[PDB]
Amino acid sequence: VKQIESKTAFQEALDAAGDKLVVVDFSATWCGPSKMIKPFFHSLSEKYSNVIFLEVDVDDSQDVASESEVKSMPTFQFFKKGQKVGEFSGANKEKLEATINELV
Numbered sequence: 001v002k003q004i005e006s007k008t009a010f011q012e013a014l015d016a017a018g019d020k021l022v023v024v025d026f027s028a029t030w031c032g033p034s035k036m037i038k039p040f041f042h043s044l045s046e047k048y049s050n051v052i053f054l055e056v057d058v059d060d061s062q063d064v065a066s067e068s069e070v071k072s073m074p075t076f077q078f079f080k081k082g083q084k085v086g087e088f089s090g091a092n093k094e095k096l097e098a099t100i101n102e103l104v
């Protein structure tokens with residue numbers, strides 16, 4: 001999992017994923033559900049080696065969370081070729097797995 005820290009480093013890793021799906025975990029260290037799903041998000045990134053996993057810590061990078069309109073954590077946003085295709089909020093491991101498999 002790549003940690004994302006600015007509006008430009010976000011702009012950039014999207015440009016770079018090529019065709020791969022990109023999943024973005026918006027998390028906080030003080031958020032119980034974010035902490036719970038953190039190592040699961042990491043473990044998925046060991047598995048879906050053809051999917052790009054990024055994390056935005058909303059305290060570290062509030063301007064990125066603000067651009068992304070993220071105020072509840074954890075929120076997962078999904079991007080394909082530069083574009084946001086879907087999102088959801090909550091530490092829902094089944095939904096996370098299912099969505100990764102759904103999105104083309």
Ligand SMILES: [Cl-]
Nearest residue numbers: 030031032033
């Ligand atoms: Cl919380």
Ligand SMILES: [Cl-]
Nearest residue numbers: 031071072073
């Ligand atoms: Cl929260």
Ligand SMILES: [Cl-]
Nearest residue numbers: 031033073074
């Ligand atoms: Cl919460």
Ligand SMILES: [Cl-]
Nearest residue numbers: 092094095098
């Ligand atoms: Cl279910």
